[PDB]
Design a protein around this ligand. Sequence first.
Ligand SMILES: [Cl-]
Ligand SMILES: [Cl-]
Ligand code: NA
Length: 130
Amino acid sequence: KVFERCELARTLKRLGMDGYRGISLANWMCLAKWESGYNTRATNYNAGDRSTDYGIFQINSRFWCNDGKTPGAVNACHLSCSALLQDNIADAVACAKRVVRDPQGIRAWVAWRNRCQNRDVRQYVQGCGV
Ligand SMILES: [Cl-]
Ligand SMILES: [Cl-]
Ligand code: NA
């Protein structure tokens, strides 16, 4: 499923993402935008280390979900990576919450540092009613 901007904003707010571990809703919106373009079925194979990024938040199989083919990987979210490819983002959101519970926080995603950190991210949520 490819979410429309405000539709996603409202969904994330309902799932409790606004201010989760100090991360504003607009930061989550910026992250999803640059990681997948708000596309839940996005997959990205990393030839360099044999891991794959799954779903709307492009969560990596090396540490967060199990896909069985990633060497020396763990499954901290305790989920099959298949769960992060559903149209319903509940599981993806629960896992993202797990990721930011680590000390790096939102910084765990390099794309956030490049395109969201220290920027005016208000644009991602303007006019959505959240
Ligand atoms: Cl699962
Ligand atoms: Cl599994
Ligand atoms: Na894994």
